[PDB]
Design a binder for this molecule. Structure first.
Ligand SMILES: Cn1ncc(-c2cc([C@H]3CCCO3)c3c(=O)[nH]nc(CN)c3c2)c1-c1sc2ccccc2c1C#N
Ligand SMILES: CSC[C@H]1O[C@@H](n2cnc3c(N)ncnc32)[C@H](O)[C@@H]1O
Lengths: 625, 302
């Protein structure tokens, strides 16, 4: 199931054309709203007084058809950046006319070309149109992967084509788009329609378009190969790009006439549907996270807040996570109780933050497969979840489990524990104050006691994603700092983004913390070697943790626990994007700050440029103690 | 009202070309309204044009007519909006206009077309940036060149060198072609070129107009500001010492001499002037058509 469209520059009759397009199997159509050759004068007589109609009648389609089937194309003669002044004036008026007519029709999207470097006036006219009534209509900027000048045949005798690698020159089309969308102040209505040439550029050019708002991919018929049967196919290099684009769920647009006239025209389309069915199906996790892709979420604060019922239900829907807990408890019980003492040695386990008791059941499963005796305490400060624990404790567990409705930092334990087990970790390891909670609970852990997890570590990596920067930018709220949305982290299933360097460790905590001078404040400096040209929009966060010995949990991509749904990455945005050239080092600083009431993070970029310090004094974001 | 001829002709007239005996070929297309198509017409009486009831033949096409040109005495070669290059041929009675072949080879609007010296090959330009050399007999593309980086605005075959032709594009390149060389294109040293015209009596001499209204005289430089808008076309008169007809989007026609000086000026058209053709019978009569549905017969003073 691919959402494909057909691009046309010649429509004799809309009713006849649109029917033949849909019968071939397309979902929409790109066509001009005025005749492509119908040049129009707006200033000089006698041409300005040309009698109408100026284009087709809107009655030729239903309102629903204009809303869902037609994509408008700007007329190719409209050049608002021409060096001729008379041509600029006419183009400005014609662009406003064609755009306003598209808005009159309620078209879902409108196509504008980026085929040269200077589109400044084109940007101004479009920006003016956008600030004329609030609408949802999209603008697809048609931009080629490779500029036409850089793919022309080397047939001009006295002007040979460049045969030496121009690393930045081969990225020129991305600079066209970047300068255009920056002039337009990152308008959420302006997206990219990337056009795929017959010869693909280097990999660093395709990676340039990572994290960019690509809504459509334009595939000319002239890039398709012909197999033995005579049907259009693609090269293995082009197939590799299509697979990358299907992960972005872009819409594919077929342009150009039918060169394989021996076959019908839906043959190009059937090959896309063919490539679509052949790909690795959802691998449980991708099946679960699908829908949350690039969706910003406020990071849970299970200490300050009481989590709802269906939140716990989601926590309990990850068996791989808890079987890792069960194994960690299993290995720990064997190392503490020798075989000759399996009947006399009762180990005191304390779940610290039990929720609705998945760790409690994981503990009961561990002691059984290990054949050891355990005495369980289930500590949970959320009184609503304590209701679930106590119905569980009366109906099944029995006297073996003791529920304690209390904060682990204030609870006066009747005895000391051999093992404490906790699941207080967030996407950034310690962003839920697992260090502070386990510190207060430390006093009732035995001198040789074991904490599970034993230690955890947070990771950071600079990322590029103009899409995510826009979504953060769209999180302005009425009665707070207009920039506070950039000074707070977000839990998000990162998707359309570009990782600019390998993740590096940030903060580490160990439990039990035998140190006499406990201090959970941190200050860390990181230097990320960037080997590409890009724009820095923020830093992705992950974490690793050691449950016990070799049993671990990880959402860090290179060591991700295979098959685990739990914990999306965290996103630390920055107020202003930062240009980064190839070979430059991104230097970021992070602080974990705290007082008696709150813990928070502050961060700043120091290289290649300096950013402002973000979230100073927790003014925009604090984690409640 | 000949058979298989549409009763109504499209508003926008795009081309007008005389042949040997004096019949006038008309190419029109509808650029607005419900249907966006085109038609072809033949007027053995030039003064009866553009009245559809008194023509010699006519036919409707699937799409518009961006450019056309004669192929001999009974052949009509058409550059279509549909991306195809069509060839139509009159019957022996010259009462019907039948399609000979229709090949969809360009990926965008075919904007310009021109027949080469041998009369058996033709070169076409399109907004898909391509230029194609055609075999009119085998109905196939001989060569396909992508030398420009923008829309191909105009292609003009050399009058007597069967392998030479000119092309200009919005990439601000004027290319001289010679399919005998390994690299067939060669760049000739502003404002975007929009119209080309070889000199009929001098081999290495041609003229080109730009989108700013300047006509220039170039050798393998003299120029004058003729129009106030884009120069759409340039046609030389059939005289021994020829004149230069220049039509533009300023709705005016100008006639120039050897040194690009203005001898005549017509503003009879109210919309864009799209083509001009010199009568082979009366060398002083000049016929111009435009998007105002006017077919004007000028008497140029010589
Ligand atoms: C916004 N936020 N902040 C923190 C957590 C979170 C998430 C998870 C898991 C559940 C499934 C995907 O992670 C866990 C968890 O498993 N254990 N513990 C904690 C807190 N210490 C925990 C905390 C979340 C949540 S809400 C939720 C609901 C539907 C889909 C995904 C997420 C998701 C994520 N990621
Ligand atoms: C598994 S999500 C973390 C769980 O631990 C609980 N929790 C967090 N902090 C504390 C604390 N200080 N004392 C007791 N339970 C806690 C939360 O209420 C939630 O059920």
């Amino acid at each position: 199931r691919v959402s494909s469209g057909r691009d046309l520059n010649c429509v004799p009759e809309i009713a006849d054309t649109l029917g033949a397009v849909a019968k071939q199997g397309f979902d929409f159509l790109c066509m001009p709203v005025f005749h492509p050759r119908f040049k129009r004068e707006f200033i000089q007589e006698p041409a300005k007084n040309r009698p109408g109609p100026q284009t087709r009648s809107d009655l030729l389609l239903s309102g629903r058809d204009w809303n869902t089937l037609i994509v408008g194309k700007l007329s190719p003669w409209i050049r608002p950046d021409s060096k001729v002044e008379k041509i600029r004036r006419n183009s400005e008026a014609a662009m406003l006319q064609e755009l306003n007519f598209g808005a009159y029709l309620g078209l879902p999207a409108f196509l504008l070309p980026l085929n040269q470097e200077d589109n400044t006036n084109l940007a101004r006219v479009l920006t003016n149109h956008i600030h004329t009534g609030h609408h949802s209509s999209m603008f697809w900027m048609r931009v080629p992967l490779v500029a036409p000048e850089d793919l022309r045949d080397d047939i001009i005798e006295n002007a040979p084509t460049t045969h030496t690698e121009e690393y930045s020159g081969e990225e020129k089309t991305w600079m066209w788009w970047h300068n255009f969308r920056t002039l337009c102040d990152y308008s959420k209505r302006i997206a990219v329609a990337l056009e795929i040439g017959a010869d693909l550029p280097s990999n660093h050019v395709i990676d340039r378009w990572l994290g960019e708002p690509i809504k459509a991919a334009i595939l000319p018929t002239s890039i398709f190969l012909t197999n033995k049967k005579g049907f259009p196919v693609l090269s293995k290099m082009h197939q590799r790009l299509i697979f990358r684009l299907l992960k972005l769920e872009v819409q594919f647009i077929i342009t150009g006439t039918n060169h394989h006239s021996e076959k019908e025209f839906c043959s190009y389309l059937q090959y896309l549907e063919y490539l679509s069915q052949n790909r690795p199906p959802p691998n449980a996790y991708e099946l679960f996270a699908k829908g949350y892709e690039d969706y910003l979420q406020s990071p849970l604060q299970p200490l300050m807040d009481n989590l709802e019922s269906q939140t716990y239900e989601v926590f309990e829907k990850d068996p791989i996570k808890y079987s890792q807990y069960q194994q960690a408890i299993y290995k720990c019980l064997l190392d503490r109780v020798p075989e000759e003492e399996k009947d006399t040695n009762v180990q005191v386990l304390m779940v610290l933050g039990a929720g609705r008791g998945p760790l409690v059941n994981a503990s009961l499963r561990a002691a059984k497969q290990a054949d050891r005796r355990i005495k369980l305490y289930a500590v949970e400060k959320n009184p609503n979840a304590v209701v679930t624990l106590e119905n569980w404790q009366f109906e099944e567990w029995g006297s073996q489990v003791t529920v304690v409705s209390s904060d682990m930092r204030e609870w006066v334990a009747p005895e000391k524990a051999d093992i404490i087990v906790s699941e207080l970790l967030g996407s950034f390891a310690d962003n839920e104050l697992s260090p502070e909670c386990l510190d207060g609970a430390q006093h009732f852990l035995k001198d040789d006691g074991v904490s599970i997890p034993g230690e955890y570590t947070s990771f950071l990596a600079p990322i590029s994603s103009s899409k995510l920067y826009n979504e953060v930018r769209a999180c302005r709220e009425k009665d707070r700092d207009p920039e506070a949305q950039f000074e707070m982290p977000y839990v998000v299933r990162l998707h359309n983004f570009h990782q600019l360097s390998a993740p590096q460790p940030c903060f580490t905590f160990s439990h039990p913390n035998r140190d006499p001078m406990i201090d959970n404040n941190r200050y860390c400096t990181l230097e990320f070697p960037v080997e590409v040209n890009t724009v820095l929009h923020g830093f992705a966060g992950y974490f690793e943790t050691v449950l016990y010995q070799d049993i671990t949990l990880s959402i860090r991509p290179e060591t991700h626990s295979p098959g685990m749904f739990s914990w999306f990455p965290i996103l630390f945005p920055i107020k202003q994007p930062i240009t980064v050239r190839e070979g430059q080092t991104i230097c970021v600083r992070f602080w974990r700050c705290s007082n008696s009431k709150k813990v928070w993070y502050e961060w700043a970029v120091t290289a290649p440029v300096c950013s402002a310090i973000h979230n100073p004094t927790g003014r925009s974001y604090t984690i409640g103690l | 009202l000949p058979p298989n001829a549409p009763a109504c002709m499209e508003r926008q007239l795009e081309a007008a070309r005389y042949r040997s005996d004096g019949a006038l070929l008309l190419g029109a297309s509808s650029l607005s309204g419900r249907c966006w198509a085109g038609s072809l017409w033949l007027f053995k009486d030039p003064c009866a044009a553009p009245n559809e009831g008194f023509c010699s033949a006519g036919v409707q096409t699937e799409a518009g007519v961006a450019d056309l040109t004669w192929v001999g005495e009974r052949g009509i070669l058409v550059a279509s909006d549909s991306g195809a290059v069509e060839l139509w041929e009159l019957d022996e009675n010259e009462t019907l206009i039948v399609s000979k072949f229709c090949k969809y080879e360009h990926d965008d609007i075919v904007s310009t077309v021109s027949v080469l010296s041998s009369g058996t090959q033709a070169v076409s330009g399109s907004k898909d940036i391509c230029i194609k050399v055609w075999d009119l007999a085998q109905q196939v593309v001989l060569s396909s060149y992508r030398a420009h980086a923008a829309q191909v605005t105009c292609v003009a075959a050399s009058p007597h060198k069967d392998s030479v032709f000119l092309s200009c594009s919005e990439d601000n390149r004027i290319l001289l072609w010679d399919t005998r060389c390994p690299k067939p294109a060669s760049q000739i040293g502003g404002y975007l070129p929009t119209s080309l015209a070889w000199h009929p009596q001098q081999s290495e001499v041609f003229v080109f107009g730009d989108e700013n209204g300047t006509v220039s005289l170039v050798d393998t430089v003299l120029s004058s500001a003729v129009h106030s808008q884009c120069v759409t076309g340039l046609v030389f008169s059939p005289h021994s010492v020829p004149f230069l007809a220049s039509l533009s989007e300023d709705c005016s026609l100008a006639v120039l001499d050897s040194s690009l000086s203005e001898l005549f000026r017509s503003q009879a058209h109210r919309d864009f002037v799209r083509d001009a053709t010199w009568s082979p019978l009366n060398h002083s009569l000049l016929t111009t058509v435009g998007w105002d549905h006017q077919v004007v017969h000028h008497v140029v003073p010589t």
